[PDB]
Amino acid sequence: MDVAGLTDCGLIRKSNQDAFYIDEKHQRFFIVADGMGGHAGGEEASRLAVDHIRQYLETHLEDLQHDPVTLLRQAFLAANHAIVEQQRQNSARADMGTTAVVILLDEKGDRAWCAHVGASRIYRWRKDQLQQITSDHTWIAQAVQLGSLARQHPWRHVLSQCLGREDLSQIDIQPIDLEPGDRLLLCSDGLTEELTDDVISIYLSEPNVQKAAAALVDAAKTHGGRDNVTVVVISV
Ligand SMILES: [Ca+2]
Ligand SMILES: [Ca+2]
Ligand SMILES: [Mg+2]
Ligand SMILES: [Mg+2]
Numbered sequence: 001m002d003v004a005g006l007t008d009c010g011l012i013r014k015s016n017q018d019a020f021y022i023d024e025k026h027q028r029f030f031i032v033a034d035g036m037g038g039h040a041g042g043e044e045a046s047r048l049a050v051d052h053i054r055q056y057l058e059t060h061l062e063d064l065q066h067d068p069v070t071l072l073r074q075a076f077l078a079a080n081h082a083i084v085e086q087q088r089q090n091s092a093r094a095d096m097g098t099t100a101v102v103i104l105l106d107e108k109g110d111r112a113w114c115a116h117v118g119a120s121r122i123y124r125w126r127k128d129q130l131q132q133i134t135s136d137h138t139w140i141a142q143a144v145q146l147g148s149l150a151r152q153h154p155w156r157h158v159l160s161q162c163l164g165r166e167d168l169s170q171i172d173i174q175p176i177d178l179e180p181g182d183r184l185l186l187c188s189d190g191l192t193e194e195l196t197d198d199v200i201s202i203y204l205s206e207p208n209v210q211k212a213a214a215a216l217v218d219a220a221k222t223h224g225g226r227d228n229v230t231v232v233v234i235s236v
Helices: 041-064 068-088 139-145 197-203 209-222
Strands: 002-008 018-022 029-036 100-105 111-117 121-126 129-132 172-177 183-187 229-235
Touching: 002 018, 002 209, 018 041, 018 229, 029 041, 029 183, 029 229, 041 068, 041 100, 068 100, 068 111, 068 172, 100 121, 100 183, 111 121, 121 197, 129 197, 183 209, 197 209, 209 229
Parallel strands: none
Antiparallel strands: 002 229, 018 029, 029 100, 100 111, 111 172, 121 129, 121 183, 183 229
């Protein structure tokens, strides 16, 4: 398997509050986080999420990989608590929060557990078709699930769930089986606010994952780059 990861402040934002991690040693897990909060809170929250999820997975993967749902829930909860602790004792950053999307590959490497909180996304690509795997935790997406139909709504990026909340009430986890040649994309909404799924799907057809990741980021910026943008591209 081949993997590439890139983050970029974009063309507008003063600082980058996205973060990511790739397990380059064993290629077992991959993490993207999109932080929010003034007074540099967003940067702290996304960094905490990535570091705490990584550390939890590194520490507990051997013991728990037979129960990936429990493992991933506990990793996210560790991140959540770490952010809340810093809130509780950091008045200026009391509202900091972050999304996270995580892929954990099983040992064989052909099943991906997809875990998330927020509106960063995981997609799977296969033979020029693209499928969004995660369901955005936004009020606007929830409505679309129910009886109202959003891509232009001014509040589309308003989150209904986020790490950094004592009242975190949902961690979505589901497995996806993989075939050779599939690709997986983890991305912050800095990508999807600029590029339609059709466009994303084309860049993911680029044989070289290094180039595909660079192309997605460059395209997001060419289209406006109004937000921080982060991608991790995995080729199965
Ligand atoms: Ca952000
Ligand atoms: Ca964002
Ligand atoms: Mg097969
Ligand atoms: Mg644009």
